[PDB]
């Protein structure tokens, strides 16, 4: 049972914030209904095992998830893989199992402080009511809510650019880089 022990050890090192980030990044393969009762890494690992995306002989998706959240130490401590190999594998086209849109959204979320979050919520007071986007929700929840009303998506990004222009311009640089990827 060495594999299960390794998975449990990996899951032991993830707190609430990292689990939330993993849940948001895995929205392309886990629907909302199966994601609501998830509160610990073991449930998420079971869900991944259900679709045969993670197993004894297939750790590529787990490596990608752990690298995209900048938990580099867990990659080498347990999975025995360094940063250079992960970058080389990911840079190859057609090998990434996560769309660049989700990665861009997560990276934008990571680079916003609390005051900037309040500014974002205030700038989103026109299209969406302030009550639905109060102080309780964080940036990822706001992104999910925008995705729900198809105001933000793969083909539509104008509202996001206009809102982000008020706060900073480096975020616009990230969006432009993502566009250059397409």
């Amino acid at each position: 049972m060495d594999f299960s022990r390794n998975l449990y050890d990996i899951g032991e090192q993830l707190d609430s914030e990292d689990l939330a980030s993993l849940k948001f990044l895995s929205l392309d393969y886990i629907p909302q209904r199966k994601q609501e009762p998830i509160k610990d890494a073991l449930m998420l690992f079971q869900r991944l095992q259900e679709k045969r995306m993670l197993e004894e002989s297939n750790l590529s998706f787990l490596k990608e998830l752990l690298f995209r959240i900048n938990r580099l130490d867990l990659l080498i401590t347990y999975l025995n893989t360094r940063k250079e190999e992960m970058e080389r594998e990911l840079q190859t086209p057609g090998r990434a199992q996560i769309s660049a849109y989700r990665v861009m959204l997560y990276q934008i979320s990571e680079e916003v402080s609390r005051s900037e979050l309040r500014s974002f919520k205030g700038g989103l007071q026109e299209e969406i009511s302030k009550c639905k986007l109060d102080d309780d929700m964080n940036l990822l929840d706001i992104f999910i809510e925008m995705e729900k009303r198809v105001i933000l998506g793969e083909g539509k990004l104008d509202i996001l650019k206009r809102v982000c222009a008020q706060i900073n311009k480096s975020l616009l640089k990230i969006i432009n880089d993502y566009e250059e990827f397409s």
């Binding site: 909302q32 209904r33 609501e36 259900e50 679709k51 045969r52 729900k148 009303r149 198809v150």
Partner: protein, 172 residues
């Protein structure tokens, strides 16, 4: 075989069993027991290895497909490309919609649909499939017309599901 059926039925869940029963309701009255359902399916002769593979693919359980049925995702994809004899696209769309709703959404839906359905029928602790079959019995939701479902989804502020419905309409 026969033991593989028992192995498959012992590794499922209550909600998954309910979804399977709802999917198989297309082909008389559905029994509440999964083992009885498999027995009746084998008796009717519609049961087949490819049909069972498609049925398990429709519920996203590829691990069971490779563990018991000795087939991969590509095999069932090719079988679907041949023909989807067992289930219809309408039930697939219903299941896909039902798997993208959380507890708050179903609560809002049952609150809004209290006019058509009595309070005793809905009760509580029910999933979206239960509301779907309740509307189907009253002949309100059917492949011919989806106006009520579309309006209900519009009211609860979920337009992506409306786009899914419109995509299904344009496909057919």
């Amino acid at each position: 075989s026969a033991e593989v059926i028992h192995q498959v039925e012992e590794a499922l869940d209550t909600d998954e069993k309910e979804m399977l029963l709802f999917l198989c309701r297309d082909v008389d009255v559905v029994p509440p027991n999964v083992r009885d359902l498999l027995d009746i399916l084998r008796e009717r002769g519609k049961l087949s290895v490819g049909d069972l593979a498609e049925l398990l693919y429709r519920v996203r359980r590829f691990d069971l497909l490779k563990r018991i049925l000795k087939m991969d995702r590509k095999a069932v994809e090719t079988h679907l490309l041949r023909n989807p004899h067992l289930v219809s696209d309408y039930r697939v769309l219903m299941a896909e919609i039902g798997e993208d709703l959380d507890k708050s959404d179903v609560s809002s839906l049952i609150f809004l649909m209290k006019d058509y359905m009595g309070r005793g029928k809905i009760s509580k602790e029910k999933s979206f499939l239960d509301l779907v079959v309740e509307l189907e019995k009253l002949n309100l939701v059917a492949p011919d017309q989806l106006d009520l479902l579309e309006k209900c989804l519009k009211n609860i502020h979920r337009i992506d599901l409306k786009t899914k419905i419109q995509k299904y309409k344009q496909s057919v």
